[PDB]
């Protein structure tokens, strides 16, 4: 009676209750059972008739669209790209909501339930022709890196912790995390969006221990990271292939995606073998298949070509099968003595495959 | 379209028009906003409810640079990541709500000692009567040269008076609410008697390296004070217009000096 | 940064005042000159198109460098010769004609991850030695997804 805005929590409710229910039930008996949409549109009309189109336009922006407040992906991105912990983020959230009345940041459970779309292991896919020794479930995130290596007082003692994904899981998650880029490339190169030809992906790998990352008579520890990055995507169209995806900066820091990491050495050969051999098993497995998953509308297919390159010099002398660094045979590509390079300088060629080193072993 | 619901629901137009005309007499704006707000509140989507309450309340999008400073320092953020957060909410929202760093430094040097005027009615011998003096070295002109005694301790300090006037000015709404709540006016002079307790403590080692393993034990110690009780004697008696609810916290021990030595 | 800073022509100008002989002056001038003439091929991300004039020089510009390394400096490069020189001397153009670029396919991209690993261990942790790398991996992945960095690069109208 004083005003609706001077009225309390249900004061306005019991004041205009009969008018409220009569026009609401008249509307949902009129327009097929919805009152909110028709009521909002008539409120926009009734406000914007009074030369106040600014609030009407921002309201039409924020309902059925974007505007004030933030999408959860935005607040996740700005949480992670400042490395802020959760608790201080919560404090920032609660004081912003306390000051401005609005709700611009999101709460934390709403953060995680938008996070789970961005790990590996969310989206369905089909390996065809399927992969031996590979569990076919598509709900795989973190598993332990030991592959359940039985470890008790009678066996070999192990001391390391390693966490990893599977290879195909992180691979499809990285593929779906660039749908905007590949669709942009197909739009810009005068192609059709409805094309599910067999794309070819070329992927770089990398592995270099990051020793002495210890924290406190000072005894250290080391750690090895194994990582990869999508590098070039093309598609054989007609009689030629054409790039949909190159990279601006290949060796960037913010475009090198992890795959596995361990608290071990680069020289303790045993634990390094016993951890990395599942990964090389999967890597050998998916070199003879196609991949099928839904990429924004139509499902598409994939093949692969790998180039393990980002090993330094010492590691590739240590895992491919050469001796230590101070040898006489020096070039990891050709086969010449160190003493030979002093006489003849520049006349060799690359002559070291992988299977050749297998048969030489 | 615009015209489709206008013709299909002109019945609702004339209905709520005349019904606001006959209930309280013609405030179609207010009843229509409350009815749409009740329509959307019922959906349990209350974020839109108080967003609409904010926009039709006429609330401001951006905020104080002062509260920006408080939220900056209570998360321990560098200026760089603050610039990241500022530019991303600018580019995303379209309107700017967090504030750039000019305003942060400008609201900052409001709060430091050395911005306000102040005076002493006795002239304070050996005290520099300059009021624009904040952070200076604690060495007070000590020679650490090769002809002198060797010292190494790095000292940072204010003066005692400027910190005192700053720590008295920042609690201004506390003392005003003490004047209102304990039945006095604003226009009451002092003299206010101020109970200041003081403290000083070493903190152990404060460093760690990575390079040559075993680092050194850098010992450190700060000197500090606390405003805890503001009293005023008016009339016949005195009245404690500020009592500190907890003097031994980590929010109410303002520092004076820092030095890197042993106790 | 030290590696880039030490390679100036002016550093050769600086060391020339500490050595007497003209022979050593012109030798070191030609040395650093040829090394800077041959640097950007293996250094860039797309040298087949970006600096492609120095591509076809590289055989000639390497052979003369090797020969004046032999004759003028047989005091040191007569027996032992370090292997990186053999790599940067005799295997670059075969690789480039094989594989396009070089400096794309580098280990630069991961070795700078030390700061990310250390900071993630420090500030976002639970300290239980089994989750304590799990959340590190989760945050490290959540960093490097491109769908989020597109949002962070929004200020690019
Ligand atoms: Ca290494
Ligand atoms: Ca390294
Ligand atoms: Zn060779």
Structural write-up:
- This is part of a larger assembly, with three copies of chain A.
- By secondary structure, chain A is an alpha+beta fold.
- Chain A is 35% helix and 16% strand.
- In chain A, a hairpin with a 2-residue loop joins strand 5 and strand 6.
- Chain A is elongated and about 100 Å long.
- The termini of chain A are far apart.
- Chains A and B meet through helix 2, helix 3, helix 4, helix 5 and helix 6 of A and helix 1, helix 2, helix 3, helix 4 and helix 6 of B.
- The structure holds calcium ion (2 copies) and zinc ion.
- Zinc ion (ZN) sits at the interface of chains A and C.
- Chain B: This is V(D)J recombination-activating protein 1.
- Chain B: It is found in: Nucleus.
Task: Please give a handful of descriptors for the protein shown.
part of a larger assembly, 3 chains, 361 residues, alpha+beta, nine-stranded mixed β-sheet, binds calcium ion, binds zinc ion
Molecular shape of chain A:
elongated
The bound ligands are:
calcium ion, zinc ion
- Relative strand content of chain A: 15-25%
| Rg of chain A, Cα atoms, Å | 30 Å
Report the helical percentage of chain A: 25-40%
Largest sheet of chain A: 9 strands, mixed
Number of strands of chain A: 9
The separation of the N and C termini of chain A measures: 96 Å
Structural class designation of chain A = alpha+beta
